[PDB]
Design an enzyme around this catalytic site. Structure first.
Site, short mmCIF file in Angstrom:
data_model
loop_
_atom_site.label_atom_id
_atom_site.label_comp_id
_atom_site.label_asym_id
_atom_site.label_seq_id
_atom_site.Cartn_x
_atom_site.Cartn_y
_atom_site.Cartn_z
N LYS A 1 3.72 -3.31 8.78
CA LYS A 1 4.79 -2.07 8.42
C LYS A 1 5.96 -2.89 8.90
O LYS A 1 6.55 -3.14 9.76
CB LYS A 1 4.69 -0.94 9.46
CG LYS A 1 5.68 0.24 9.18
CD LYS A 1 5.54 1.30 10.21
CE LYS A 1 6.42 2.45 10.01
NZ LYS A 1 6.13 3.54 10.72
N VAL B 1 5.15 -0.76 3.51
CA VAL B 1 3.98 -1.07 4.24
C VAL B 1 3.00 -1.78 3.58
O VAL B 1 2.79 -1.42 2.04
CB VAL B 1 3.39 0.58 4.65
CG1 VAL B 1 2.07 0.33 5.57
CG2 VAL B 1 4.45 0.96 5.74
N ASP C 1 7.23 14.96 12.26
CA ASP C 1 6.95 14.58 10.74
C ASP C 1 5.58 14.47 10.31
O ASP C 1 5.15 13.74 9.36
CB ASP C 1 7.52 13.08 10.41
CG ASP C 1 7.89 12.81 9.08
OD1 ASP C 1 8.04 13.66 8.49
OD2 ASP C 1 7.65 11.51 8.59
N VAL D 1 0.66 -1.15 0.01
CA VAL D 1 0.06 -0.03 -0.13
C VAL D 1 0.90 1.32 -0.18
O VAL D 1 0.51 2.22 -0.43
CB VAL D 1 -1.04 -0.05 1.24
CG1 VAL D 1 -2.09 -1.01 1.06
CG2 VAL D 1 -0.35 -0.22 2.71
N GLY D 2 2.10 1.21 0.52
CA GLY D 2 2.99 2.30 0.25
C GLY D 2 4.29 2.18 1.24
O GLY D 2 4.79 0.98 1.41
N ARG D 3 4.83 3.23 1.43
CA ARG D 3 5.97 3.17 2.18
C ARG D 3 6.05 4.14 3.18
O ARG D 3 5.02 5.25 3.14
CB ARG D 3 7.37 3.54 1.37
CG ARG D 3 7.31 4.88 0.59
CD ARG D 3 8.34 5.13 -0.18
NE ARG D 3 8.18 6.34 -1.21
CZ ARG D 3 7.72 6.20 -2.48
NH1 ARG D 3 7.61 4.92 -2.98
NH2 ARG D 3 7.53 7.09 -3.19
O1 LIG Z 1 -1.88 2.71 7.34
C1 LIG Z 1 -0.68 3.10 7.17
C2 LIG Z 1 0.48 3.15 8.18
C3 LIG Z 1 0.12 2.88 9.51
C4 LIG Z 1 1.03 3.21 10.30
C5 LIG Z 1 2.27 3.44 10.14
O2 LIG Z 1 3.41 3.81 10.97
C6 LIG Z 1 2.72 3.89 8.83
O3 LIG Z 1 3.88 4.18 8.18
C7 LIG Z 1 1.61 3.72 7.77
C8 LIG Z 1 2.10 3.85 6.14
O4 LIG Z 1 3.17 4.39 6.07
C9 LIG Z 1 1.27 3.86 5.27
C10 LIG Z 1 1.54 3.89 4.01
O5 LIG Z 1 2.59 4.46 3.57
C11 LIG Z 1 0.46 3.65 3.06
C12 LIG Z 1 -0.80 3.42 3.17
C13 LIG Z 1 -1.20 3.04 4.71
O6 LIG Z 1 -2.49 2.73 4.82
C14 LIG Z 1 -0.16 3.26 5.67
#
Ligand SMILES: O=C1c2ccc(O)c(O)c2C(=O)c2c(O)ccc(O)c21
Length: 325
Positions: free
Chosen positions: A62, A47, A150, A39-41
């Site tokens: 994560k 992540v 951040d 879903v991403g970074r």
């Molecule tokens: O839920 C998180 C998420 C939940 C807790 C985290 O500490 C986090 O970095 C993410 C996160 O980076 C993230 C993302 O990059 C892209 C989609 C996401 O749903 C998330």
């Protein structure tokens, strides 16, 4: 310098609360959580949307990139301390690969609507609403003696479908201790306060309010990012071209900072550019005198002059959000 609010939170609490290096992690079951899709970074992580194989519940996985033991304990402790305040991500479990020892943090499921596509469609009301929800998360974590350090669009996860907001990625966060001198290599460039850019190390919760100010400025003006600098030097120049060099000079004198001569040269001499000069036909429906009064009290060089999160929530700008709430 010191914080005007919550300065003594970590002074009055048991040492165990803030002493994250003394934490010993209880590692859960690695096999309990399967990766469904990337879903991403995060800042130092990859992540994934995941699933709990025991109950079929969705989760966030994560997977952290290799980093020092101190740093992982810091994130985990801050996350345990903040579970479950308003609009904070919920840490559910901590696990690791037996062989490579690469750790995974497991969160309650968070859905993500890409901010770059979402922000252009936000109504005047939605911006009041979501910023208010962000302000609740920030007031809470500040009240618990933690700075996020951040705050940025990516770290403010909005589910527009369900109208939920989560403050995520606590990997750069710290406990506030009066007088302590922090690393300025935090936040992300466009959202870095002047304190970070002029090497003022004894900063506080007020750092997060500058970052929010930057996000709020980008929303109402539809100029994203609001301050678009190339490197750290240029990021200060961009701030000085809006706020003016006079206000910068009174700030640097107040805290007794001398700018590096090259940076001083790059900054130069500038006048203040009124907020209303950023209004155009694309953003006119979002810019109101209440929005500007609010923004003005956030984007201040002096971190001590900025509105606290608690003050911000009571600004008449959010009046309708409170009344509905
Ligand atoms: O839920 C998180 C998420 C939940 C807790 C985290 O500490 C986090 O970095 C993410 C996160 O980076 C993230 C993302 O990059 C892209 C989609 C996401 O749903 C998330």
């Amino acid at each position: 310098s010191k914080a005007r609010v919550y300065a003594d939170v970590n002074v009055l609490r048991p040492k165990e609360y803030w002493d994250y290096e003394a934490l010993t992690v209880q590692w859960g079951e690695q096999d309990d959580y399967e990766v469904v899709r990337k879903v991403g970074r995060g800042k130092y992580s990859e992540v994934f949307e995941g699933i709990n194989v025991n109950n079929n519940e969705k989760c966030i996985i994560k997977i952290l990139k290799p980093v020092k033991k101190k740093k992982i304990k810091r994130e985990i402790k801050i996350l345990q301390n903040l579970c479950g305040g308003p609009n904070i991500v919920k840490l559910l479990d901590i696990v690791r690969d037996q062989h490579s020892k690469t750790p995974s943090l497991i969160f309650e499921y968070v859905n993500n609507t890409d901010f770059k596509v979402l922000y252009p469609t936000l109504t005047d009301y939605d911006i009041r609403y979501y910023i208010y929800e962000l302000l609740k998360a920030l007031d809470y974590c500040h009240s618990q003696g933690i700075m996020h350090r951040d705050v940025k669009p990516h770290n403010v996860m909005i589910d527009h479908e369900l109208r939920k907001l989560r403050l995520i990625d606590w990997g750069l966060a710290e406990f506030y201790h009066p007088g302590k001198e922090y690393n300025v290599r935090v936040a992300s460039r466009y959202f870095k306060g002047p304190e970070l850019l002029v090497d003022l190390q004894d900063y506080d919760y007020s750092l997060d309010m500058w970052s929010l100010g930057c996000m709020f400025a980008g929303m109402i003006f539809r100029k994203e990012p609001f301050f678009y600098g190339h490197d750290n030097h240029d990021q200060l120049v961009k701030i000085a071209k809006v706020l003016g060099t006079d206000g910068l000079n009174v700030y640097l004198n107040k805290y007794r900072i001398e700018l590096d001569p090259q940076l001083e040269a790059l900054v130069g001499r500038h006048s203040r550019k009124p907020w209303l000069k950023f209004m155009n036909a694309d953003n006119q429906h979002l810019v109101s005198p209440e929005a500007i009064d609010f923004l003005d009290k956030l984007l201040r060089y002096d971190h001590q002059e900025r509105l606290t999160a608690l003050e911000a929530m009571t600004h008449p700008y959010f009046q309708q959000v409170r009344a509905a709430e």
